[PDB]
Ligand binder design. Structure first.
Ligand SMILES: [Mg+2]
Ligand SMILES: [Mg+2]
Ligand SMILES: [Mg+2]
Ligand SMILES: [Mg+2]
Ligand SMILES: [Mg+2]
Ligand SMILES: [Mg+2]
Lengths: 51, 109, 236, 225, 63, 128, 125
RNA sequence: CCGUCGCCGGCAGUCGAGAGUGGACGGGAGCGGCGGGCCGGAGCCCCGCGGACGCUACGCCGCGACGAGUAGGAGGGCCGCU
RNA sequence: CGGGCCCGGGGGGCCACGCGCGCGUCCCGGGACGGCGGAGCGAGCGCACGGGGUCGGCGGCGACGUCGGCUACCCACCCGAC
């Protein structure tokens, strides 16, 4: 079987290359996307109260 | 009717002091003299239109004797206007200080 | 068949996690334990040609070439052009005025209709204003201005696919040597179907151009650069 | 004969899938554990500093122990004692970072190379981004891109490092098998620093680059890899 | 540029017999196959001794 | 209508000019074909800027387009008809070439044999 | 032996043509005409060759006997197939695949025999 | 992309039937999942008779690092002359 | 917003938690937790940030004037060059 050269892809930019090396990176990512949308919705409630 | 391209000067090639790299040209577009003012032009098609002796074919007409070398504006060069441009074949040095058209094709507006 | 039951946060990441989606699918109770034609027979042409013929379709080739080319590896992307996702520039909403930059109708001011399936923009100039008929035009050869006409409550006919506007071909059935010059088919003629779809759309776009003042003369002029204006300083 | 040889073939492909999903769950939970352990470390430095400011006292942190050296000066006209030290750090070419373990043996030979290297104390983001973007391995003296965890696990696996996340924890929390993990990495190949060097030939604390900029080396790594 | 030395890169070593003896070249093909497809290090010793010069391969007496 | 090669890659030459010998312009006694400049002060040998380039191994062409004619084929030189049939099974990657010595009577027979044997001939108009 | 004879005729042979960066070979029972150990019509205990017929109709399939390896007057048995193009190929395919007679020269015998029939078709201008 | 060096790298498995991180049996005792009338068990390919290329083994294929040079050394020359 | 798989006992979020019997430990007959026990494989669809590019996308032009190709052909300019 010929093993040719695998093109090195950037896991810092390519998501499924990151998940092949770190499967936990998906769980951090869904926790930080949801946490940033929960804090952002919580700061447009402070702005929509003092107005 | 109307001009419909923006007029630019071929200044020179991308160069050091004692070396020049003829594959990249340097253009001065009239009207823009700051690097923040040049983001409009960064993908735009550009042409060097000139005339020669023999007739060549014209796409969309009878054989003229105008010929075109096509290029693209790729990046900015410096702090005052001055984009640099990559042409399909390198510009002849006869063109230095003549007109290069900048075209408004591919648009982002 | 149900929907996906797992909304997307961003592309390639679902919202609900792995064990959370075990229980939204009720997989705790929904689990499972364990478990041509190539030849035909074709009848006799007898008598005493006895027995039917077994004949295969897909016969074996009469001529192999001298050499062949090895087949490719596999790619995991790389869809055909019919399956590309179409993008539309955010400046362009249905009803905007476009400045055509490229064709025979350079400089014209046309009004943007529906976007077609292959990404091309179905545009009309009102033919009574600037002689651009219902055409396609390309997205990146077009400047979107900021002027808008409400094309809501305007009925575009649904037989206006990409196949409606695609050019026609004839040449060249049964002709092998060039002596007989043929001055036919290089003239394009407007069909009656093409000519009344224009009238169906101009009939209901024009009352909204005559609504706002002096948009007509704007849509009759052509765009140009003069000794003043530079396009990075213009506002479109 | 023939039907029994499918069923022995389909059951050995079944054990390999069960073994594969067990190993994916191990490296998942090892990385969830390391995420907790980095919060343990990062929050503790804040709490130890706050409880000293309450009592009117000072908290001196631990003297750091992971450094990241970078050769900044090229290979022309280098004195021989300096030239031998740079090839013990595996800095054979310009812009060729590596991790070193700080102790008195390694600090006194980083002082020999003061004007050739720039170094300091990297943080967790810098050791993540160098391993993922630019980490290659020395696998029977070849330089192999770390595109899969089986490359790490076939070499460092007898030390407990079986995925790229374990390797990052072994470098950053300078563990008992730091030596084998660091030597597994082919030394890094960084580009030219984007935005300039600000006078390469002189020391950092007098306006240049050489020597120990201490945690500002992280600001250099971002614009260099 | 890198700071390495190149004078010992090419390591001097036989990798075929220098003779054109066709019976010797023919059992080099046998033992080169046996050295590849086998874990035996006997065949890897016998292969390289077939490569050697006559003076690196002396006569063994019967006694 | 000509015979087509098997595949036709884009042939990229790393250099299209020849390597002329240093100072072959200044003399008739110096021919243009290359000799390596062995001389203690030679500015070609020492590779100054703006001088004649010296041939080296980095200019070597991609070795799947090497010796390829500009129409996809590779050249094989033939003398008579019976050594034309070694190209019978090299049909779509090698083309025959009748050598210069072959007379007018005999290179008729090479041309029509190769036409009925699907072999492209590079000079099939040579005594006509 | 086929290997021992090959070490003689590998570089020194009257059938061997070495011209510009390529080598050919002109011995009779050689498919592909390449100088190779697998394709060599003289050294193996069993060979296959295909040639055009006496006149320009058909192909002559010649195979090699088991028995008389040192008897060149009777070592080869020659068969003329003059079928259509499709069934002369399934004939050569059966002479190699069904007898297991040297079944590595199989498709090289089909590429040659198909190309030797296309040579016999009447040329059109 | 070209070359060199290294991997004492790979390819004689042209094995479309080759297939093993051990296999067989052969009785002693048993399970599940199969055919229920609680009794019982091998498919040796084929409706297709068929399935690219290769391996001048001094060949072919892969992977990684590397490339200044006088004097001088050494190799290759399908460079040339009689 | 310390640690103890956020020790444990009682009274909205998250989980890469999810067969039964049989033993184990623990907790309050009941549980929870097991890395423990002698017994064979789920199947089919899709989608893809996944072992290096494709289109199942398109247009124009053409024999006595144009198309492409050319270098030890000539000339021109820029840069380099004793
Ligand atoms: Mg004009
Ligand atoms: Mg210096
Ligand atoms: Mg050297
Ligand atoms: Mg000197
Ligand atoms: Mg050298
Ligand atoms: Mg010398």
């Amino acid at each position: 079987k010929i093993h040719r050269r695998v093109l090195k892809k950037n896991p810092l930019k390519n998501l499924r290359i990151m998940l092949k090396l770190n499967p936990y990176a998906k769980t951090m990512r869904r926790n930080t996307i949801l946490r940033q949308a929960r804090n952002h919705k919580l700061r447009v409630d402070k702005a929509a109260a003092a107005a | 009717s109307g001009r419909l391209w923006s007029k630019a000067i071929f200044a020179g090639y991308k160069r050091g002091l004692r070396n020049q790299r003829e594959h990249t040209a340097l253009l001065k577009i009239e009207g823009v003299y700051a690097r923040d003012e040049t983001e409009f032009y960064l993908g735009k098609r550009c042409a060097y239109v000139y005339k020669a002796k023999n007739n060549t074919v014209t796409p969309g007409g009878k054989p003229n004797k105008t010929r075109v070398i096509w290029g693209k504006v790729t990046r900015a060069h410096g702090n005052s206007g001055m984009v640099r441009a990559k042409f399909r074949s390198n510009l002849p040095a006869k063109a230095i200080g003549h007109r290069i058209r900048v075209m408004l094709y591919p648009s982002r507006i | 068949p149900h929907c996906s039951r797992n909304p997307v946060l961003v592309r390639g990441i679902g919202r609900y996690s792995r064990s959370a989606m075990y229980s939204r699918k009720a997989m705790y109770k929904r689990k499972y334990s364990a478990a041509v034609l190539a030849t035909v027979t074709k009848p006799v042409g007898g008598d005493k040609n006895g027995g039917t013929r077994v004949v295969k379709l897909r016969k074996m080739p009469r001529y192999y070439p001298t050499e062949d080319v090895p087949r490719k590896l596999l790619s995991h992307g790389k869809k055909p052009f019919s399956q590309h996702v179409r993008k539309l520039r955010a400046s362009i909403t249905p009803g905007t005025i476009l400045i055509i930059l490229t064709g025979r109708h350079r400089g014209k001011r046309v009004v943007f209709l529906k976007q077609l399936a292959s990404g091309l923009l179905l545009v009309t100039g009102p033919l009574v204003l600037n002689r651009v008929p219902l055409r396609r035009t390309h997205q990146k050869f077009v400047i979107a201005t900021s002027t808008k006409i409400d094309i809501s409550n305007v009925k575009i006919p649904k037989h206006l696919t990409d196949a409606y506007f695609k050019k026609k071909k004839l040449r060249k059935p049964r002709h092998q040597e060039g002596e007989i010059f043929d001055t036919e088919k290089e003239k394009y003629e407007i069909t009656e179907q093409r000519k009344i779809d224009q009238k169906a759309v101009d009939s209901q776009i024009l009352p909204k151009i005559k609504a706002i003042p002096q948009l007509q003369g704007y849509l009759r002029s052509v765009f140009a650069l003069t000794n003043g204006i530079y396009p990075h300083k213009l506002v479109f | 004969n023939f039907a029994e040889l499918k069923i022995k073939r389909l059951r050995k492909k079944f054990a390999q899938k069960m073994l594969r999903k067990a190993r994916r769950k191990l490296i998942y939970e090892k990385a969830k554990h390391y995420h907790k352990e980095y919060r343990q470390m990062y929050r503790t430095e804040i709490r130890m500093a706050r409880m000293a400011r309450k009592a009117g006292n000072f908290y001196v942190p631990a003297e750091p122990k992971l450094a990241f050296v970078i050769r900044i000066r090229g290979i022309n006209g280098v004195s021989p004692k300096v030239r031998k030290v740079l090839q013990l750090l595996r800095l054979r070419q310009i812009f060729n970072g590596t991790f070193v373990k700080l102790n008195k043996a390694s600090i006194n030979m980083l002082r020999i190379v003061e004007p050739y290297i720039a170094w300091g104390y990297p943080n967790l983001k810098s050791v993540n981004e160098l391993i993922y973007k630019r980490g290659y391995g020395k696998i029977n003296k070849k330089r192999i891109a770390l595109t899969d965890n089986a490359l790490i696990a076939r070499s460092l696996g007898k030390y407990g490092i079986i995925c790229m996340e374990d390797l990052i924890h072994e470098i950053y929390t300078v563990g008992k098998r730091f030596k084998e993990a660091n030597n597994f990495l082919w030394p890094f190949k960084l580009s030219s620093p984007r935005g300039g060097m600000k006078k390469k030939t002189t020391h950092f604390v007098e306006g240049g680059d050489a020597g120990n900029r201490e945690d500002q080396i992280n600001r250099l790594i971002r614009r260099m890899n | 540029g890198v700071d390495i030395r190149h004078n010992k890169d090419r390591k001097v070593r036989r990798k075929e017999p220098k003779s054109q003896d066709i019976y010797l070249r023919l059992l080099v093909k046998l033992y080169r196959f046996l050295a590849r497809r086998t874990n035996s290090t006997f065949n890897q010793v016998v292969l390289k001794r077939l490569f050697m010069s006559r003076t690196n391969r002396p006569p063994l007496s019967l006694s | 209508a000509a015979l087509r090669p098997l595949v036709k890659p884009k042939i990229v030459k790393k250099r299209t000019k020849k390597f002329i010998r240093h100072q072959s312009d200044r003399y008739v006694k110096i021919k243009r074909n290359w000799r390596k400049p062995r001389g203690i002060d030679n500015r070609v040998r020492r590779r100054f800027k703006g001088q004649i380039l010296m041939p080296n191994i980095g200019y070597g062409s991609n070795k799947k387009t090497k010796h390829m004619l500009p129409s996809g084929f590779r050249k094989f030189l033939v003398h008579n008809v019976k050594e034309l049939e070694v190209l019978l099974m090299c049909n779509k990657s090698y083309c025959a070439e009748i050598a210069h010595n072959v007379s007018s009577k005999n290179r008729k027979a090479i041309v029509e044999r190769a036409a009925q044997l699907a072999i492209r001939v590079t000079n099939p108009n040579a005594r006509l | 032996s086929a290997h021992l004879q090959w070490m003689v005729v590998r570089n020194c042979s009257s059938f061997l043509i070495k011209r510009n960066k390529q080598t050919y070979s002109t011995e009779p029972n050689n498919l592909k005409a390449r100088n190779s150990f697998r394709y060599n019509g003289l050294i193996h205990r069993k060979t296959v060759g295909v040639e055009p017929a006496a006149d320009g109709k058909g192909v002559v399939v010649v195979i090699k006997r088991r028995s008389g390896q040192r008897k060149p007057a009777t070592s080869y048995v020659r068969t003329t197939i003059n079928k259509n193009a499709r069934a002369t190929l399934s004939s050569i395919r059966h002479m190699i695949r069904k007898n297991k007679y040297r079944p590595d020269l199989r498709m090289a015998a089909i590429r040659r025999a198909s190309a030797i029939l296309r040579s016999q078709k009447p040329v059109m201008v």
